[PDB]
Scaffold this active site. Structure first.
Site, PDB file in Angstrom:
ATOM      1  N   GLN A  90       0.705  -1.203   0.013  1.00 28.20           N
ATOM      2  CA  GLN A  90       0.161  -0.051   0.340  1.00 28.20           C
ATOM      3  C   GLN A  90       1.248   1.202  -0.267  1.00 28.20           C
ATOM      4  OE1 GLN A  90      -2.765   0.773   3.787  1.00 28.20           O
ATOM      5  NE2 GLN A  90      -3.554   2.013   1.998  1.00 28.20           N
ATOM      6  N   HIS A 117       1.619   3.544  -3.667  1.00 32.46           N
ATOM      7  CA  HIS A 117       0.355   5.047  -3.357  1.00 32.46           C
ATOM      8  C   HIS A 117       1.456   6.051  -4.182  1.00 32.46           C
ATOM      9  CE1 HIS A 117      -1.905   2.542  -2.287  1.00 32.46           C
ATOM     10  NE2 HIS A 117      -2.895   2.973  -1.416  1.00 32.46           N
ATOM     11  N   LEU A 142      -5.824  -3.587 -11.249  1.00 24.88           N
ATOM     12  CA  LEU A 142      -5.113  -4.574 -10.648  1.00 24.88           C
ATOM     13  C   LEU A 142      -4.266  -4.949  -8.913  1.00 24.88           C
ATOM     14  CD1 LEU A 142      -2.109  -6.037 -11.056  1.00 24.88           C
ATOM     15  CD2 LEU A 142      -2.589  -5.033 -13.758  1.00 24.88           C
ATOM     16  N   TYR A 143      -4.185  -3.659  -9.007  1.00 20.55           N
ATOM     17  CA  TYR A 143      -3.280  -3.399  -7.930  1.00 20.55           C
ATOM     18  C   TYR A 143      -4.495  -3.178  -6.451  1.00 20.55           C
ATOM     19  CZ  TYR A 143       1.727  -4.100  -6.984  1.00 20.55           C
ATOM     20  OH  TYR A 143       2.955  -4.707  -6.152  1.00 20.55           O
ATOM     21  N   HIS A 175      -7.229  -5.316  -1.567  1.00 20.12           N
ATOM     22  CA  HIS A 175      -7.881  -4.566  -0.656  1.00 20.12           C
ATOM     23  C   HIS A 175      -8.621  -6.188   0.144  1.00 20.12           C
ATOM     24  CE1 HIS A 175      -8.761  -0.701  -2.614  1.00 20.12           C
ATOM     25  NE2 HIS A 175      -8.484  -0.766  -1.385  1.00 20.12           N
ATOM     26  N   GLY A 224       0.412  -7.520 -14.095  1.00 21.56           N
ATOM     27  CA  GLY A 224       1.391  -7.322 -13.237  1.00 21.56           C
ATOM     28  C   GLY A 224       2.864  -7.064 -13.528  1.00 21.56           C
ATOM     29  N   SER A 235       5.227  -3.626 -13.583  1.00 26.33           N
ATOM     30  CA  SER A 235       5.592  -3.256 -12.238  1.00 26.33           C
ATOM     31  C   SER A 235       7.024  -3.543 -12.575  1.00 26.33           C
ATOM     32  CB  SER A 235       5.355  -4.649 -11.630  1.00 26.33           C
ATOM     33  OG  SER A 235       6.932  -4.543  -9.924  1.00 26.33           O
TER      34      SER A 235
END
Ligand code: HEM
Ligand code: HEM
Ligand SMILES: *[C@@H]1O[C@H](CO)[C@@H](O[C@@H]2O[C@H](CO)[C@@H](O)[C@H](O)[C@H]2NC(C)=O)[C@H](O)[C@H]1NC(C)=O
Ligand SMILES: *[C@@H]1O[C@H](CO)[C@@H](O[C@@H]2O[C@H](CO)[C@@H](O)[C@H](O)[C@H]2NC(C)=O)[C@H](O)[C@H]1NC(C)=O
Ligand SMILES: Cc1cnc(NC(=O)C2=C(O)c3ccccc3S(=O)(=O)N2C)s1
Ligand SMILES: Cc1cnc(NC(=O)C2=C(O)c3ccccc3S(=O)(=O)N2C)s1
Ligand SMILES: CCCCCCCCO[C@@H]1O[C@H](CO)[C@@H](O)[C@H](O)[C@H]1O
Ligand SMILES: *[C@@H]1O[C@H](CO)[C@@H](O)[C@H](O)[C@H]1NC(C)=O
Ligand SMILES: *[C@@H]1O[C@H](CO)[C@@H](O)[C@H](O)[C@H]1NC(C)=O
Ligand SMILES: *[C@@H]1O[C@H](CO)[C@@H](O)[C@H](O)[C@H]1NC(C)=O
Ligand SMILES: *[C@@H]1O[C@H](CO)[C@@H](O)[C@H](O)[C@H]1NC(C)=O
Lengths: 552, 552
Positions: free
Chosen positions: B172, B176, B353-354, B357, B495, B499
């Site tokens: 997270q 972010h 996709l990230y 939660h 991903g 990434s």
């Protein structure tokens, strides 16, 4: 105070302080080692005996014309030579960029802040004893003294390569989309956040400006019809900010992408041509795509004109100034299997070297008339009076001045030539020789070697004392030209790699962009690949007058 | 209406309208030809008959522990294998970028505007008869219905891979910095103009904010001491804008680079750790370079921390979520002789996709206490109460929730998971199978092949009817996970490439940056190259508590 002030690292080694009075040279990947990265590895010794000098290569490209004529007519041979010259012109530019006026070491601020011009060589630190670091005297010779003695024009020295006013103004118009100094901030700052050929000088730098310039029908730009000819809209009609002196009537304040293009009718001429070109392409695209909306027509045309610009710049503009017998080729495909970064950052030094003001004449000859600077500047009446066709015809006929060779800066813009010198000092530019080493050229061992003569050399000798103190900006303008050439060695060897990264680094050259569907299909792709300065003029100027960047 | 609505072009061919009810596929460089770019060229069948499925590769990377243990201890071999994964993952992302939320065709607006997230697939055209193009119904199934029936958590489903809360909060905190949606503009817009690992979440997006957060002595960030522990400064102390509910007392309004990090003690945990790490590097750098000033100390520390971050992300974080037995390696030198673009634009789909939660537990367990979401959110008192050491020790022990496999989204963030559905549709995302095709994955033939089960499968069948209308986001959270893994096939295969570009596309990985002097010498370089999540915590958390991303 700073131990790196003497720039002791050679061969692109990097200097780093390790105490108040000691330094270290990072020789990583330079091919050299030692305290100052001067002693060479084995393989590098081989390279240094196998590679010819720029002048050697320049001679070959400018001679054996009968041979080059055979090369130019064998497509595969032409592509392979172009492939070579492409990749040979590549190892020299930091991409992603590194330094700027505020950072002599690599920093995230320097990388991320798009408001700075980038920097080929880091600035001389503020705590250095002399302006060039350690050598020379405490203060640099009077800029006025340099300007008056070796730069100002006595009599007009014509360019031996025969560059005309179509060339000079195309140079000014083309480069002024990415040389846009934000004087509010300072000389090391730019307003051209695209940092390359985005055609913002036609379409505007910001979305708000582009929209005010747009017709929002068929993808076209707003325009007016004066007489029977197409011209840019006015400030009054569009509310786009242009730089005009207050005495200019509102009906003569033409509004275009670049705020400053009202300065010269020669600028406004190209702005007008390119405006017609955009809308012409709009008609072509509409005919191919009657299902397209205004937005897609506009966006696709812009991509096409971006393409035409790069094409024309390589195959007409640079083709001419290079003087090469070899026929240069715009073909992104040649890089698809090579290591190359599709990005670019405008270097401050590129801006500085491109101050080609000696190109200008003492008067501007348009048909019968001979206009002085004060009559010419900020005067769009002249463009209306003579029209686009007479402008092209006249400009094609008028010879431009030589840039190198010294003493050819027209007096009318003496303040500009001076400003270039002072702002270079203000931005803490390293010396001429520092830049020569950086672009793999041997340093001039005397002022006479630089000029190729004696009178200007002696004049500079008494001003600078040391050759290693000679400044970059005055040097290129006073540099001994190549035989019958407009430019000297340093000008070409610095400008070429900068320019390449500008044109080739554009995203439309990337493999995922360089395909017909990017450009509305095959007919749009063909527009880019068959573009030329003659076709640009022939499609948009009444009568299809002949043109070239050289005097016939 | 748009003849490209059905996405007829395959194998990454580009669709273009050639009239109102006709289209054309640009098959350029796809390795296929024909109307829809489906019939393969000769060399293409070879490639297709020689490449294994992602599942086959994932198998080999997650089995033969014994063999990988030999490869891992042969630097030659390890490096050789890393180079190969590095390149096999780098033909998938368009770089420079292409489409965005407003442009289903390439345009200069989409390329140059850094405020948009880019798009791996173009948006479905507005005039399309159905949300997915032409398949399915006029309207997509109720997002509230999809949310409740297959996404929301019944009971907590732990991650078989053993991912903990150090991992969840690191995911997270790290992501972010580049997932910062500008909700003023819309879900397709970002505030992260760096578009990557710039550590703006520590230093601020802008200069004004950065300077407010700096101590302007020894390159350090501002901080306060509470107890005997170092914490970030406050809003009153720095004047930086933070997001806090009005009831939060002034002394608890912590100011960090990212304005939203004060909403979660987990976020505030890493913000504090990384703040300490920066100042720590300042101490080291000042010792090496007593002749350096505040500015250079700060910038060099920032570069070093960026490097640490990429290093920890690759070799600890990604290393853990991958489940690979192969020891991944962060080495920019591995790319130097390869074709690779040192640039990155954050894709909207990478953002979507990230949304992991389901990682979140029902209660956050710090020592003897178990806090609910209400108790946890915007409550920095918890951090001050327990301290960093205990936060680390507790979050290391607490298991995170499985992400793939359906029904694991905690109810406390149901509005979030729903918004991801609504906003995906708002951004006109194409279907799951389109994205699988885009990323060289075979389309799922049924809802049961997607989930690997029957109850959720049939549940989705009654909602979407055709599997070719299954939306990307809910599919990722409901997908059949790899054997005892946290993710399914689609998650990993989308991903990874995104990434990779984000990490390896950073300018510090470019040849001209990746050298000792960039980071203040061999000592700063050594900090990046020996960095780990364990050393990060050990150096900056009192008592040097053990940590990893896996429950012990
Ligand atoms: C009638 C013709 C011209 C006039 C009156 C003129 C005048 C000027 C002036 C006053 C400036 C400084 C303005 C400022 O810094 O705000 C300038 C800058 C410059 N000039 Fe010219 N010039 C002319 C032609 C040309 C040509 C033919 C070139 C060809 C390359 C050229 C290249 C440049 C460049 C590269 C700059 C720096 C621009 C920037 O960074 O913003 N100029 N010129
Ligand atoms: C207590 C823990 C968490 C809470 C309360 C929470 C809540 C939220 C909320 C309210 C949003 C929407 C923000 C907005 O629309 O302005 C959001 C977005 C998001 N969440 Fe979380 N979340 C948590 C943990 C996580 C974790 C562990 C991840 C792991 C990757 C994650 C990934 C994301 C991402 C990537 C976004 C999009 C961010 C953006 O574009 O601005 N979240 N979350
Ligand atoms: C990036 O794209 C956005 C989206 O269009 C641009 O934002 C708009 O700006 C105009 C004025 O120039 C406003 O009328 C719109 O309301 C804006 N869009 C919104 C608020 O979503 C933005 O200008 C672009 N960025 C740049 C630097 O050009
Ligand atoms: C790029 O760097 C320039 C130079 O520092 C920044 O301009 C300074 O910005 C501050 C605001 O934080 C102002 O107080 C100064 O007046 C500016 N100085 C100059 C010389 O313009 C600019 O903000 C930076 N750009 C970005 C996008 O961060
Ligand atoms: C003053 C200048 C001297 N040289 C200039 N540019 C070139 O010499 C140059 C290009 O700009 C370029 C453009 C595209 C492909 C290759 C070339 S080049 O080889 O670097 N060359 C002619 S500008
Ligand atoms: C949900 C995710 C699944 N996979 C992720 N990333 C990777 O799988 C991945 C990297 O991020 C990466 C980083 C640096 C070098 C190489 C790799 S990788 O090969 O693309 N791989 C493990 S994120
Ligand atoms: C955890 C909160 C559940 C959301 C309430 C709506 C549930 C409607 O959904 C039903 O829930 C059942 C519960 O598992 C399932 O057996 C059914 O398949 C599902 O349709
Ligand atoms: C390196 O440069 C310094 C400073 O210019 C000079 O004094 C010294 O002799 C050089 N040393 C070597 C080994 O080249
Ligand atoms: C501007 O150019 C026009 C051309 O028609 C000329 O007549 C006029 O004298 C010029 N104005 C100035 C101020 O030189
Ligand atoms: C191409 O795709 C279109 C749209 O799905 C389809 O109708 C057509 O039959 C296809 N043509 C071929 C030759 O596959
Ligand atoms: C804030 O955290 C404290 C523990 O420090 C806790 O007791 C309290 O319930 C929390 N506040 C809210 C509103 O939940």
């Amino acid at each position: 105070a700073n131990p790196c002030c003497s720039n002791p690292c050679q061969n692109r080694g990097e200097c780093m302080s390790t105490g108040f009075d000691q330094y270290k040279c990072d020789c990583t990947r330079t091919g050299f080692y030692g305290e100052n990265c001067t002693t060479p590895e084995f393989l590098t010794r081989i390279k240094l005996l196998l590679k010819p000098t720029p002048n050697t290569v320049h001679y070959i490209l400018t001679h054996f014309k009968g041979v080059w004529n055979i090369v130019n007519n064998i497509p595969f041979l032409r592509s392979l030579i172009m492939k070579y010259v492409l990749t040979s012109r590549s190892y020299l530019i930091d991409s992603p960029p590194t330094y700027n006026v505020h950072y002599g070491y690599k920093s995230w601020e320097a990388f991320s802040n798009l408001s700075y011009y980038t920097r080929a060589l880091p600035p001389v630190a503020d705590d250095c004893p002399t302006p060039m670091g350690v050598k020379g005297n405490k203060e640099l010779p009077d800029s006025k003294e340099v300007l008056e003695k070796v730069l100002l024009r006595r009599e007009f020295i014509p360019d031996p390569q025969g560059s005309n006013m179509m060339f000079a103004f195309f140079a000014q118009h083309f480069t002024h989309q990415f040389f846009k100094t934000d004087h509010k901030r300072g000389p090391g700052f730019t307003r051209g956040l695209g940092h390359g050929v985005d055609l913002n000088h036609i379409y505007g730098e910001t979305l708000d400006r582009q929209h005010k310039l747009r017709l929002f029908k068929d993808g076209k730009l707003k325009y007016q019809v004066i007489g029977g000819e197409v011209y840019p809209p006015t400030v009054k009609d569009t509310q786009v900010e242009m730089i005009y002196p207050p005495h200019i009537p509102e009906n003569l304040q033409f509004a275009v992408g670049q705020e400053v293009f009202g300065l010269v009718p020669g600028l406004m001429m190209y702005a007008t041509i390119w405006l017609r070109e955009h809308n012409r392409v709009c008609d072509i695209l509409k005919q191919e795509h009657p299902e397209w909306g205004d937005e897609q027509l506009f966006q696709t045309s812009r991509l096409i004109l971006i393409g035409e610009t790069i094409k024309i710049v390589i195959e007409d503009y640079v083709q001419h100034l290079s003087g090469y017998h070899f026929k240069l080729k715009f073909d992104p495909e040649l890089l698809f299997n090579q290591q190359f970064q599709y990005q670019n950052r405008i270097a401050s030094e590129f801006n500085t070297l491109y101050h080609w003001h000696p190109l200008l004449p003492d008067t501007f000859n348009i048909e019968d008339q001979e206009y002085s600077f004060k009559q010419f500047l900020y005067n769009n009446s002249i463009l209306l009076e003579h029209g686009l066709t007479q402008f092209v015809e006249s400009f094609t006929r008028q010879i431009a001045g030589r840039v190198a060779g010294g003493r050819n800066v027209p007096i009318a813009v003496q303040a500009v030539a001076k400003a270039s010198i002072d702002q270079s000092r203000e931005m803490k530019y390293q010396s001429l020789n520092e830049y020569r080493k950086r672009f793999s050229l041997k340093p001039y061992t005397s002022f006479e070697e630089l000029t190729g003569e004696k009178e200007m050399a002696a004049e500079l000798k008494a001003l600078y004392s040391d050759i290693d103190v000679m400044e970059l900006y005055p040097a290129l303008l006073v540099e001994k030209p190549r035989p019958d050439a407009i430019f000297g060695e340093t000008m070409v060897e610095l400008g070429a790699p900068f320019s390449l990264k500008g044109l080739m680094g554009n995203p439309i050259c990337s493999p995922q962009y360089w395909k017909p569907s990017t450009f509305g299909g095959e007919v749009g792709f063909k527009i880019i690949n068959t573009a030329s300065i003659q076709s640009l003029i022939c499609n948009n100027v009444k009568g299809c007058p002949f043109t070239s960047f050289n005097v016939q």
